[PDB]
Amino acid sequence: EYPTVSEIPVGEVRLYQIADGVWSHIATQSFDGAVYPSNGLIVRDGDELLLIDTAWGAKNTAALLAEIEKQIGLPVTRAVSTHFHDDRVGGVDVLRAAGVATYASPSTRRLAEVEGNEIPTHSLEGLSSSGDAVRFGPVELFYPGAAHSTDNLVVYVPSASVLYGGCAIYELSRTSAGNVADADLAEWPTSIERIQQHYPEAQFVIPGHGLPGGLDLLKHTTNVVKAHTNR
Ligand SMILES: NCc1ccc(C(=O)N[C@H]2Cc3cccc(C(=O)O)c3O[B-]2(O)O)cc1
Ligand SMILES: [Zn+2]
Numbered sequence: 001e002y003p004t005v006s007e008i009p010v011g012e013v014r015l016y017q018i019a020d021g022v023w024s025h026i027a028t029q030s031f032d033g034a035v036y037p038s039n040g041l042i043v044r045d046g047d048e049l050l051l052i053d054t055a056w057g058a059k060n061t062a063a064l065l066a067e068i069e070k071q072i073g074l075p076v077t078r079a080v081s082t083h084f085h086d087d088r089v090g091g092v093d094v095l096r097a098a099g100v101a102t103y104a105s106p107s108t109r110r111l112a113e114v115e116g117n118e119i120p121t122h123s124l125e126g127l128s129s130s131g132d133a134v135r136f137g138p139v140e141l142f143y144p145g146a147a148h149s150t151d152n153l154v155v156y157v158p159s160a161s162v163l164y165g166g167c168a169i170y171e172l173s174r175t176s177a178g179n180v181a182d183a184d185l186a187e188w189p190t191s192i193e194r195i196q197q198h199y200p201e202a203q204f205v206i207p208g209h210g211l212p213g214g215l216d217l218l219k220h221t222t223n224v225v226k227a228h229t230n231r
């Protein structure tokens with residue numbers, strides 16, 4: 001029942017309710033002639049919503065906000081971007097213009113600037129060392145160490161045992177490396193181990209791209225990254 005890449009035209013956004021007050025958002029984007037799905041998260045915080053990640057571009061993110069207003073009808077007041085690439089910050093200007101306060105770690109803000117990408121306004125403190133965690137409204141933000149990118153964060157929703165891994169976690173159908181130009185292959189398995197150690201109770205694990213599963217997605221990702229290391 002989870003929407004798949006073949007079911008979502010580029011420019012449209014789907015919402016998937018995971019638990020009371022917890023949804024993923026799913027969009028698609030063209031990249032080198034192929035179409036990829038991408039996931040983010042929406043978490044209810046009282047009568048407001050917290051958004052995790054844009055929907056990969058300004059047009060998709062505008063559609064995301066329209067879809068949230070239509071289907072949920074509560075204001076998105078804050079958003080967190082889990083790393084500096086365009087599937088996570090692309091659309092931050094649309095969010096900002098809509099009154100959403102945008103956040104990212106200082107590491108992400110710096111890398112986005114260097115890269116010429118959109119830059120979340122607010123800096124999240126307390127995430128600069130591997131293994132650091134902070135509570136941000138209804139979620140916990142965790143810096144596991146460098147993996148898909150040096151700045152990547154993961155997000156946990158304690159009320160629903162939902163772990164959103166972002167692009168540091170691969171879906172099961174992905175059996176070879178994705179986009180790894182900015183990755184730290186040497187540290188990626190260690191960073192995943194920090195995730196497993198901190199969130200052993202996670203029930204629903206969401207990759208940056210594709211289908212959710214359980215905690216098996218962590219060991220899956222390690223296997224793929226190690227095989228790519230040994231290419
Ligand atoms: N300057 C080189 C460069 C250009 C684009 C991207 C980029 O936007 N990458 C995103 C889109 C994408 C495209 C294909 C696979 C993935 C993935 O997460 O593996 C994926 O997620 B990224 O965050 O790395 C990264 C580096
Ligand atoms: Zn990335």
Ligand SMILES: [Zn+2]
Nearest residue numbers: 101102121122
């Ligand atoms: Zn502000």
Ligand SMILES: [Zn+2]
Nearest residue numbers: 087167208209
């Ligand atoms: Zn990605």
